[PDB]
């Protein structure tokens, strides 16, 4: 049994060591899901890290436009291609189109590929959009056979190879069966939003991860599924898997997190802001109502803000924003605003997928976290939630329990 | 790398900088969703702001009928064509139709295009309904080749181009392209919502998903960005709060028992400084309190975002200090109560950026001791919140952007 | 920009001034939704009101049967056709069918049309069922082209023209795309009832109304969407957008409405009955239990009854029944029985569509109305609702509030 | 203008006057839904009541087998054919099948029809399954033409005609016609409901929608139209009400605790004047109270409207004074409790028009203090209503068609 690394941000561990070797890998998805991009990033990881030389075969695209494509994420290729990098086989269609006086055997292409390889020492080659080859030549007979002779030749040469091809979940095998291990990238549309996800049906004769898992793009494709106060009466009432403030609207947790972090700045540990609600002037005039000094609390090099409206972005992209925020600036202690907004407008398995993700990341990078949310939690989710909190009546937060014991059980009796 | 503005109202930011440059972008939607409009208005935007001349290729529509189209928006194109700026290329089928005796090399059209551009120096080109040639020519073979050489030739010329093609489906033999917007018209319940989905721009920063839109003079879209408090006054008790000028108030209570309309002195203050549900019958009912309406003057019928934009341009027209929204509950329903309206957050955000003051009325469900606050439930983002309702019963809920007496 | 009036009962205001002019209007719907009828009524409005002479082209139907069709609604045409009315071009198929020895250009038909027009001074022409022309001649090639040359010719002549053509909501463009502004009439079937509705996708280069709206038929097609006690302790408890009696089963509101109107008859203002429940003998033996005299209250020329079982008829047809009841006899004050029945068996957006309709009509034609309904309102709808109402316990109706103040707040304390 | 009766049980009023006249009406349904039956019985109705002779054209069915069909309904047609009244035209395919050497002019059939009519003077014609010729002749071209000239020829002759054709679909290449009934057989849950939908009659008064039906001798359908009170007596307390002879009573209570069966003296009164859940085991249980059943004699298994019509003709058979319905809850379920039964209103209406007295049993859901009254909830239309059930607890709900003591 064989295997080869890729190190696409978080894909490899699902394949438990990457793609098969000496075997043909087919990648299929609906138009607009970054198949070509997957090929590019794959091979660029290869040549940059492993110096595993590459061949990028393109039918749909023009080279100049594929380089101007990839240059978006900050990868400069042709100047570095002069190093003997990756070689782009141009299989873009002759614009004048072609006429036929008989049938063809696409020996020219495959032999061209193998000279290109045996010149470039390449052990890795990607191939963009075979369906275009089916829509290039209107003879759907032969292209099957000669794509097959290609993939077989690549299996002989033992090189790692990739194929990209074009309704997602339903009957999806496109039109080109003919391959030996298959990744299907689908982005599903639900309600009025978009979830980019990767399914691996199975990798034949090799360990594979069970099921489909959502992803997003950065400089290279990412997802990582699988894991595994100070102030106030503070501790008097209390005696980390993050704190929870679950409360009726106007939860005023704003207080608790604001000076949860403000003390943090006092003691010198690093703090950060991550708020998805109020315009942060009102965030700290509601905080400047306390008499604290937030704009004075940030002589830079200490905290960062720029808020973000929840609905304006998909949830796990927010997850990435704060992932590499907390990665860029390494806070000791931070707090998260209004889980409530993320609690609705979203199928609660998405929202809880998310909350398990963030809770898991924060709990064991031993970073301390807070979380606020407002009730009508009525999303019912229990578990790993740690600390929770004559005429008129005022607000009275108090705790059940923490850790494994101690605090106050009874409220403000 | 690179991208080009459209400056059509609210699309440019969805594409994170407008349409791509030197590449042909395909625009597709089901018939009757204003693709042609997007194209026309695209070239008109180009030419009016940038003096970037345009070539509009039209099969389906008739040229003179495209101008009689455009005069609805109040724009004179024939004057613009004589200005030597925009050219409407007539590629409409001769009504006499076609007879066929062989295969085609569709060079004629493309050469016509490139002569038109290289004469007008044009940097913008729209192409309305390539699908029409498919409804003209029964050969799905060659048109592949000639569309590809067209779009490619245009990329040699480097001009930005648009192709229009004919619910949640694919592209009906239009062949993949290198950047694609699919604007879809949705039919839900018993009303119809026009939305724009942008599928892909390859190698470029892009916004996530489908986004609702409506039409004005040009297409309008809804993206997503972002005395210490002069208020009413109200006698007896005079604001325990007041409601900050940059705030919004929430009165949630069973029934529309708020007929008293607290907005009465919310407005009285407005007029005080001099600054500015039959609302006729309610305003002989408002003169029951003793206010001076006759001297004060010196829902299903519209889609939600039509309410949103109409009021956008009322408040744009007259610069209100403080106004209120009547029976938001009514706007919450007629839509069935599980269809969750983002909407209110949008306008709320808007209130935040122009120091405009808003009040909000809404009717709550049952009566006594409902732990449930509001029907489909308006929570935070609302600055000022309050209750309502043995007698009628006012109370304050919870705020700490200020503090005071917790009522009753 | 151009426009032309039609005055079909309530259609024009959606088109904000009617159909386009000098442009081809296509009308499509599933079989059995009154497309042909729409054409007929259109042109009959034209010639009767505007003296805009007309041409009715028919492929499917035979003239004699189209006149016997239209004569159902009380329109007598052929005798009036002698006036130089509308001209029916007979394009009914030769029953013997036809044989083919080559292809045809349908010049005969179009030229016939234009002579007919230039003889009849016509500015308006309707055309019934083009799909039949596709199912008349089995050559689906040419009929496209020559229908196109027809519609184009009509655009040249500047005449207003209409085309009728044959699964409703889903993929509906029939088979004949070829037109320049489109009305789609669909009747949907839900549960076990039928809703006739009009959708206008868009009218090209012209104002159009946003969305689809239900309709029914009378003498001509109708719909109008878009708008915009006395006795008892009476007012002691109270101190018009209609009254509401919402109550537990056996709401006995029957009392309150019965002599709500009976006093009305006393004072002389006009009253009417609109009951959708009990056989009206029991209606007024439950009322003759009060000692009142209903059959004696109606010496005719005062009130009218004839009850109607809710389920036996679609809701907005009831709406029309009372619309032209209250229009025929002009009541001052009336009451409506058992909104409860209409509250269930119906998707509540239909029921509330309805209730907003009737409430709106009654409130500002300044007619006074009452409404009874029984709870298990639990349909939750608030707003424009005005006035609402040791061992055993009896019934006790009392009010919250009315207008903007006064009445009794407290019940029968 | 004009229309002609069918006098088939309950269809005529759905069409607001029966089938159209001088026009060919198409009858379509999925195979196995009794279209042929509608046709046969149509012509038999015509001929038996009006002595309006009929021509029945049959492809699918065999003539002798159509008579052995009809003998199920107890009707002798062969006697009617020899009476010189009805003629069953055999257009069944010769089992030996067909060979083809060219195109057809299907004049033979039509000329046969018109000879048959002009001989029998017939005014009624049925045509069962034109679709059969489509399952006979593989040319979908000409049959268009010959069906059209058939139906048209029949309209010259002015006779009323019916065409039968072969779930919620269209017409499977049958071509549009000028008035159409689609009778559909529905499959829901795990039972099947036959309904008749009537799609259109052009230029004519018509009823709205789909309407459920069942079969008897002829098809039956369910349209929609429309001592001061001798009752039980019951000792101790003797009717605080009594329940009027034209009334209906409602006893709603948790469980079938009404085993006491108030109907006991509701019936005792019936016998008193002399006028007329194992109901065997319940009637050794009824003899536990001391009544005299042995001397008294001097659900899923059937569809709802089969219960309705069966009881329609029991009450038609025996003219009851007063009878009651056992455990209506049971009829409310076995159907899943959201499937709302109109049904009970229908029979209720019926009770109103023949002075028949009815009582109704039903079991309610939980127990104490349910603001909810009845499960799927029976409200008004019920005249007399009552409650049931620390001990058992009778109480009266609310009526003012009379007044009395509000119980307990
Ligand atoms: N900066 C960026 N941010 C987000 N997405 C990007 C960015 N640059 C490129 N993309 C995405 O890359 C995708 C290109 O892949 P795709 O559309 O599937 O083309 P192909 O089929 O050739 O792979 C586009 O859909 C685009 O949304
Ligand atoms: N008063 C108006 N209001 C809204 N839209 C208008 C108006 N006048 C013209 N238009 C636009 O002109 C466009 C013509 O384009 P059209 O061909 O309808 O696009 P599509 O190809 O989607 O049918 C219409 O879609 C419509 O949006
Ligand atoms: N008095 C009437 N009441 C209700 N509907 C009627 C009346 N007279 C005619 N109609 C309706 O008119 C319709 C005729 O239009 P349709 O069936 O669509 O035929 P076409 O396709 O030729 O327009 C019929 O469906 C019929 O229900
Ligand atoms: N005892 C019976 N009960 C009910 N229906 C009967 C009985 N005997 C005969 N029939 C009727 O005879 C009809 C023959 O017509 P059929 O060909 O079944 O119509 P379809 O074309 O819908 O299958 C049956 O549909 C059935 O309704």
From Swiss-Prot, chains B, D:
Annotated catalytic residues: 60
Residues that bind Mg(2+) 1: 36
Cofactor note: Binds 2 Mg(2+) ions per subunit, one in each domain. Mg(2+) is required for hexamerization and phosphatase activity.
Statement: the UniProt record of this protein carries the keyword Translocase: no
Membrane-crossing residue ranges in chain numbering: none
KaiC domain segment(s): 1-222, 228-408
GO biological process: circadian rhythm; protein autophosphorylation; regulation of circadian rhythm; regulation of DNA-templated transcription
One Pfam entry name: ATPase
Protein name: Circadian clock oscillator protein KaiC
Species this protein is from: Thermosynechococcus vestitus (strain NIES-2133 / IAM M-273 / BP-1)
Lineage: Bacteria, Bacillati, Cyanobacteriota, Cyanophyceae, Acaryochloridales
């Amino acid at each position: 049994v064989k295997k080869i690394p890729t190190m696409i941000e978080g894909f490899d561990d699902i394949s438990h060591g990457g793609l098969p070797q000496g075997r043909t890998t087919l990648v299929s998805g609906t138009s607009g899901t970054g198949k070509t991009l997957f090929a590019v990033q794959f091979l660029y990881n290869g040549i940059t890290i492993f110096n595993e030389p590459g061949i990028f075969v393109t039918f749909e695209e023009s080279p100049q436009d594929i380089i101007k494509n990839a240059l978006s994420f900050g990868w400069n290729l042709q100047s570095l291609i002069d190093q003997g990098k990756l070689f782009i086989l141009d299989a873009s269609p002759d614009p004048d189109g072609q006429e036929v006086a008989g049938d063809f055997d696409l020996s020219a292409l495959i032999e061209r590929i193998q000279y290109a390889i045996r010149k470039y020492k390449a052990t890795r080659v990607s191939i963009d959009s075979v369906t275009a080859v089916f829509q290039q030549y209107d003879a759907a007979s032969v292209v099957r056979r000669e794509i097959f002779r290609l993939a077989f030749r690549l299996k002989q040469l033992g090189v790692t190879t990739i194929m990209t091809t074009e309704g997602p979940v339903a009957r999806f095998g496109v039109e080109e069966f003919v391959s030996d291990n298959v990744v299907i990238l689908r982005n599903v549309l639900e309600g009025e939003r978009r979830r980019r996800t990767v399914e691996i049906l199975k990798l034949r004769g090799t360990t594979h991860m069970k099921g489909e898992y959502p992803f997003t793009i950065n400089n290279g494709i990412n997802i990582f599924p699988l894991g595994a106060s100070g102030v106030k009466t503070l501790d008097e009432m209390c005696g980390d898997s993050i704190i929870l403030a679950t409360g009726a609207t106007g939860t005023g947790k704003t207080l608790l997190v604001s000076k949860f972090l403000e003390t943090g700045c006092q003691q010198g540990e690093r703090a950060l802001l991550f708020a998805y609600e109020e315009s942060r002037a009102q965030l700290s005039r509601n905080a400047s109502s306390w008499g604290i000094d937030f704009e004075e609390l940030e002589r830079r090099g200490l905290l960062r803000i720029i808020c973000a409206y929840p609905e304006s972005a998909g949830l796990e992209d927010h997850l990435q924003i704060i992932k590499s925020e907390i990665a860029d600036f390494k806070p000791s202690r931070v707090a998260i605003d209004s889980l409530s907004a993320l609690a609705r407008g979203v199928s609660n398995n998405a929202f809880r997928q998310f909350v398990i993700g963030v809770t898991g990341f924060a709990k064991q990078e031993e970073i301390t976290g807070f979380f606020t949310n407002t009730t009508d939690t009525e999303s019912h989710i229990e578990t790993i939630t740690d600390t929770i909190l004559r005429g008129e009546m005022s607000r009275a937060i108090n705790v059940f329990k923490m850790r494994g014991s101690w605090h106050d059980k009874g409220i403000r009796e």
